[PDB]
């Protein structure tokens, strides 16, 4: 195992141009496969390619590099940190995948997403539809794409951000969703919804066209002496 992997490395090591960190990178990969560790670390190394990773990983830690494509990752892999990269397109995402961090790239389209995923940032990206979201999901960034409708919403999702897109309708929102940034999109109304989240969750829709009906039925609402849902910021 060792052999093989060394042989393949020792060869991509010496294909890079001058500022990419290839060797920095062939010492990290020999130590995380010689101590069979959970985590590799090629961060800030200006990589600009990737060969075949160590099979046992479980986080994959790649952010801040030069890459247009990833190899297939590693079937028992749960996180990745794969933003600030170049990236087109994603390959398939492990069904033990629980985090995506893959903002700040030129993804057009995401692969399927795993069951079991729990958290998923896409920030500035190139996307115009997102996947299905797993059931599992905690957390979702997208904003910065080109979307114009979002999938529904699980029922334990936590956090939501979706700031500078072209969404025209927001789906209903869970009760255990405590932090919605919603900014600079093309809604004209909100989901009924957003009044009945907790007290203190955080809401913020600037920047979108919401109607005068829309203004006045929320603001009937919000502004009444009995009213328990979460402070909207217009």
């Known amino acids: 195992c060792n052999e093989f992997y060394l ?48 099979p046992q990983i479980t986080t994959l830690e ?4 030069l890459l247009t494509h990833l190899p297939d990752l590693p079937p028992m892999l749960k996180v990745i940190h794969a933003q600030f990269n170049q990236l087109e397109s994603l390959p398939a995402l492990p069904e033990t995948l629980e985090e995506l961090n893959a903002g700040d ?10 069951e079991n995923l729990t958290h998923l940032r896409v920030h500035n990206n190139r996307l115009h539809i997102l996947p299905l979201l797993p059931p599992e999901l905690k957390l979702l960034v997208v904003s ?10 699980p029922d334990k999702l936590e956090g939501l951000a979706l700031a500078n897109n072209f969404i025209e309708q927001l789906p209903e929102l869970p009760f255990s969703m405590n932090r919605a940034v919603l900014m600079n999109n093309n809604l004209t109304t909100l989901p009924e919804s957003v009044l009945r989240l907790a007290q203190n969750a955080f809401v913020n829709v600037a920047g979108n066209p919401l109607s005068g009906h829309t203004m006045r039925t929320l603001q009937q609402i919000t ?4 009213y328990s849902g979460p402070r909207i910021f217009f």
């Not at 502004?223 to 009995?226: C, E, F, I, K, S």
């Open 105 to 114: 790239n030129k993804i057009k389209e995401l692969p399927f997403l795993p």
């Open 223 to 226: 502004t009444g002496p009995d």
């Open 144 to 153: 910065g794409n080109r979307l114009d409708s979002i999938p529904p919403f």
């Open 62 to 65: 790649i952010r801040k590099n």
């Open 7 to 54: 042989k393949t490395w020792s060869e991509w090591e010496k294909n890079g141009t001058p500022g990419e960190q290839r060797n920095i990178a062939f010492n990290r990969l020999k130590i995380c496969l010689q101590n069979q560790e959970a985590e590799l670390n090629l961060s800030e190394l200006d990589l600009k390619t990737l060969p075949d990773l160590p």
